[PDB]
Amino acid sequence: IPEYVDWRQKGAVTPVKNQGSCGSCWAFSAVVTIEGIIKIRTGNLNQYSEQELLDCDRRSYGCNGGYPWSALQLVAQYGIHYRNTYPYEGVQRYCRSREKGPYAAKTDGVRQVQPYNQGALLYSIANQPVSVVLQAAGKDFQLYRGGIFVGPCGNKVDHAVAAVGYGPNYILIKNSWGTGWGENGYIRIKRGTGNSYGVCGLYTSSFYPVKN
Ligand SMILES: *[C@@H](C(=O)O)[C@H](O)C(=O)N[C@@H](CC(C)C)C(=O)NCCC(C)C
C-alpha cells in the first residue's frame, strides 16, 4: 500500500459540491464512492445523483439525515441516474427514478470497513474512495480553512464525508460544503494519533460499494 494515495490525481473524483441547507450529507458521501468505483472499473468518470438517494432511500430521512450504507444499498439493488438527468434541488420530493428512464449505473453490493482500525481504513482507501463519518458540529471544524486538522473535536459523529486519499500523517477528505471551505473544499485530518476512534471519531463507521 503506498505512502501516498490521492484519487483526484488518477481522475476518480468529481468537482466539490455544496449540500446547502439540507442534511443530505449521507447522499453526497455515498455518491463520492459510486463515482469513484465506476471510474475505477470502466475508465469513465461520471457525475451521479445525490437528489435521487435523497428522494428514494425510504430508510433514511431526506434533508435532516440518513445513512450512506442504506444509500449504497439502493444502487446495488436498483441503480442510480446521472446527476445531469436527476439534479440536486436540496429539497426532498417524490422518488422519480421511474420518470427518468433506465439507470445509468448499477453497483453490485456493499461492504463495511472494520471499525476503529486505522490500518483497515487505510487499506480500503488504497483500493477506492470510501464513505466515512466524523464530528463536524464543533467550530474549529467549521472554521477550518487550509491545514493538518488535529481538532479539537469530540467523537459524536454527525456528518458523513468521503475519504479520497491519505499521507504519512493524514487522511484526505472531500467535504460537501462549497469549494470555499477548508482546502478548495477538502480537509486533511491527522492520522496515527493511535486513538481507536480516530480524530473527531473518524473510524466510527466506513463503507464502500463493490462492483464488477
Ligand atoms: C450530515 C450533514 O451535515 O448533512 C447529516 O446531518 C447526517 O446524516 N447526520 C446524521 C447521520 C445519520 C444518522 C443521519 C445524524 O443523524 N446526525 C447525528 C449523527 C449521529 C446520530 C450522532
Cα of 158 vs centre of ligand 1, distance in Å, is 4
- Contact assessment for residue 162 and residue 168, using Cβ atoms and an 8 Å cutoff: no
Which atom number of ligand 1 is nearest to the Cα of residue 24?
4
User: For ligand 1, which residues put their CB under 6 angstroms from it?
Assistant: 19, 23-26, 65-67, 156-160
Phi and psi of 114, rounded to 5°? -60, 125
Q: Tell the CATH topology of 1-212.
A: Cathepsin B; Chain A (3.90.70)
- In whole angstroms, what is the distance from residue 208 CA to residue 125 CA? 9
85 Cβ contact list (under 8 Å, min separation 6):
49, 100, 101, 104
- Contact assessment for residue 106 and residue 79, using Cβ atoms and an 8 Å cutoff: yes
Written as nine digits, the cell of 190 is 491527522
- Contact assessment for residue 175 and residue 153, using Cβ atoms and an 8 Å cutoff: no
CA 20 remoteness from chain centre: 16
Method: X-ray
* Catalytic annotation, residues: 25, 159, 175
Nearest CA to ligand 1 atom 20: 158
Cα of 132 vs centre of ligand 1, distance in Å, is 12
- Contact assessment for residue 78 and residue 51, using Cβ atoms and an 8 Å cutoff: no
The domain segmentation of the chain, as residue ranges, is: 1-212
CB atoms within 10 A of CB 31: 29
**DSSP-based three-state secondary structure for 192:** coil
Binding residues: 25
- Contact assessment for residue 161 and residue 175, using Cβ atoms and an 8 Å cutoff: yes
147 Cβ contact list (under 8 Å, min separation 6):
182, 183, 188
Written as nine digits, the cell of 40 is 475505477
The resolution of the experimental structure, rounded to one decimal in Å, is 1.9
